[PDB]
A = this chain, B = another copy of it.
Amino acid sequence: DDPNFFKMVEGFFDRGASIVEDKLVEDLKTRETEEQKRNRVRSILRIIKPCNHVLSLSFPIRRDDGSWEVIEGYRAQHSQHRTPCKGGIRYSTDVSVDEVKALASLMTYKCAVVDVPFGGAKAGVKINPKNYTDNELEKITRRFTMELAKKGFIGPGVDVPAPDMSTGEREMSWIADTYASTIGHYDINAHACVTGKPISQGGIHGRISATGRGVFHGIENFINEASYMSILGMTPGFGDKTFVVQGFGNVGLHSMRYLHRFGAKCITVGESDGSIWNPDGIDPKELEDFKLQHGTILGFPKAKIYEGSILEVDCDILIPAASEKQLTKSNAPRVKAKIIAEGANGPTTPEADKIFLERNIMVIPDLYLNAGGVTVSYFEWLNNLNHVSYGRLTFKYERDSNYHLLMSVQESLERKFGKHGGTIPIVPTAEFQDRISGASEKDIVHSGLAYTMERSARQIMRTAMKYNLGLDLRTAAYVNAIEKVFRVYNEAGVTFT
C-alpha cells in the first residue's frame, strides 16, 4: 500500500465523480440528450483532474566551499479556473513531480471547499535544509524565484507561494524581496507576491498559528455535532478526551496549544527521531523550549521515549501532521482510536479509508482541516493588496458612532422614564468594550477563520446526508469541491477551442 501520490488523490477524485455525475447532469441546463449531457460531464471531469502546468528546473549554485551543485526544483499549477494560484514551497529530499502534481491538486480543492478564490499550486525543491548554510538557503531561494518569475510562475496575478514543510517566514521574506526588486518593481502589488511573510514585511497576525486554528475549529465543528458522536460513541467536548500529535512542527505545535488550552490532554508527540509518550499531558510551552534548546523533543524529562509509532498509540483523536501516506494498510489495523484528524496533506492511503469506515472511526478530510492556513494566507494576500491596515480608516469613527447609539438609547429613555430625572447609564459591557473601535486586524482573522470553517463544515455535513456517505466525510468533501469547480468550467465556455 504505497500508491503514486498523484494516483491516490486521483483515486479520491474518482469516487467523487462517481457520485456527483448523476446529480450534476440534472443541474446542467443546456439542451442536449441525456447520454450527450453525460458525455459532456465526464469530459469536463477529465479536464479538471490533470495539472495544467508542471515546470521543472535546475539550479547552478555556489556552495560556500566554492563547489557547484544542481538543484532540481518543481512547480505545478493544477487549475486556472481561478487566479491567482496559491501553494506552498516545500524543501525536502523526497519531493518529486509525482508528489507536487498531487499536492497541487489538493489545494485546488482545499480552496474550493473553503470558498477561497485561488487555483491550486505547489512548488518543491530537492534539498535538505538541515545541511546547508543559512547563506546558501538564501542563494537557493532567491535563484528559485528568479527562475520562476521570468517564466510566469510568481506574481500576484499568477501564483502566490506560501510556507510549507521546512520553510518559514524566513524564506518567504527572501522571495518577496527578490521579486519586488527585480521583476515586479513598478507593479504596485509587488510585495503581495507571497504570503506567510513576516509582520514587518506585510504579514498577518497569527499566520504561523493559522493552520493550527484550522485543525482546532475543524475538530470543534465536529466534536460538537452529536449526530456523529452518537455514532462514534463519544462525548461532545474537549476536556473529557485526549489526542496525540505526529510531527511536532508548525501544524503539530500549534495544533497542540489551541487544542491544549481547552482541556484536551495531549498524550504524546513524535518526529523523525522518536516518540514522547505521557498519558497525562505535555506542556506545549515547555516542550517548545527544547526544540530551541535540545534540538529534539527527545530528552524531555517530563515524559519517556516510546518504543512504537504514534499512529498505534491509544488515544481519542489522532492527528498525523508530519508527512504523507503515514497511515496505510499496515497501520490501519492497529489504530486504536476514535477520530483521525488530518493536519498533513493526504496522510491516509485510500486502502486504509475502508478499514477506517469498517472499524467505524471517523476520518476528517485534510481538505477541510488544514484549509485554515489558506484562508488566512488569503487575508494576507488581500491585506497587502489594499495597502491599508484593515480597520484603520474607521477606528475613531466607529468608536464615536457606537457612543451615539448607546447615548441615543439613553437620551430616549430619559424622556419616557426620565420623569424622575434619573440618569439611565447605558454603558458598554466588558466584551463590547473591546469591539467598540471596530474590527482590528487580528479580530477579522480570528473570525474570518472561525467563520470560513463554519460554512465549510456545514456544506460537508449537508452533503454527507444528501448522499448518505455516513462517516466518509472525505468523499463528501470532494463532492462539494467538484460541484464548485464544475460550475466554473461549465459556464466559462471552457475554451476558445
Contacts and interface: CB of A to CB of B under 8 A. Distances in A.
Contacts of A424: 412-413, 416
Interface string A179-205: 011110111111100000010110000
Contacts of A387: 117, 382, 385
Interface in A139-164: 139, 142-143, 146-147, 150-153, 155-158
Contacts of A178: 496
Contact of A182 (B83, B173, B183, B426): B183
Contacts of A389: 115
B425 A412 contact: yes
B448 A393 contact: yes
Interface stretch (A56-64, A282-290, A470-478): A56-64
A354 interface: no
Nearest to A428: B408
A427 B412 contact: yes
A281 interface: no
A152 B151 contact: yes
A231 interface: no
A320 interface: no
Contacts of A492: 173, 177, 198, 200-201
B158 A495 contact: no
Interface residues of A, number: 120
A426 B388 CA distance: 36
Interface in A55-112: 55-62, 66-70, 72, 83-84, 97
A397 interface: yes
A157 B186 contact: yes
A411 interface: yes
A405 B405 contact: yes
A18 interface: no
Contact of A401 (B53, B156, B406, B435): B435
B409 A493 contact: no
Interface stretch (A7-15, A40-48, A296-304, A339-347): A40-48
Contact of A139 (B54, B415, B497): B497
B382 A404 contact: no
B188 A189 contact: yes
A334 interface: no
A167 interface: no
B152 A182 contact: no
Contacts of A274: none
A444 B394 contact: yes
Contacts of A61: 495, 497
A174 B185 CA distance: 21
Given A46-B68, A51-B56, A174-B496, 14 more contacts: A43-B68, A47-B70, A56-B56, A56-B97, A60-B495, A151-B152, A155-B186, A157-B186, A157-B187, A157-B189, A385-B387, A386-B386, A396-B451, A415-B425
- Closest 9 pairs between A and B when the two form their complex, measured CB to CB: A43-B68, A404-B432, A396-B451, A157-B188, A54-B56, A396-B447, A397-B447, A412-B426, A47-B60
29 contacts: A50-B72, A51-B58, A52-B57, A55-B151, A56-B56, A68-B494, A83-B191, A84-B188, A151-B153, A156-B188, A174-B496, A198-B491, A200-B487, A382-B387, A386-B386, A392-B448, A392-B451, A393-B439, A393-B444, A397-B439, A397-B447, A401-B432, A404-B432, A404-B435, A405-B406, A406-B412, A408-B428, A416-B425, A417-B417
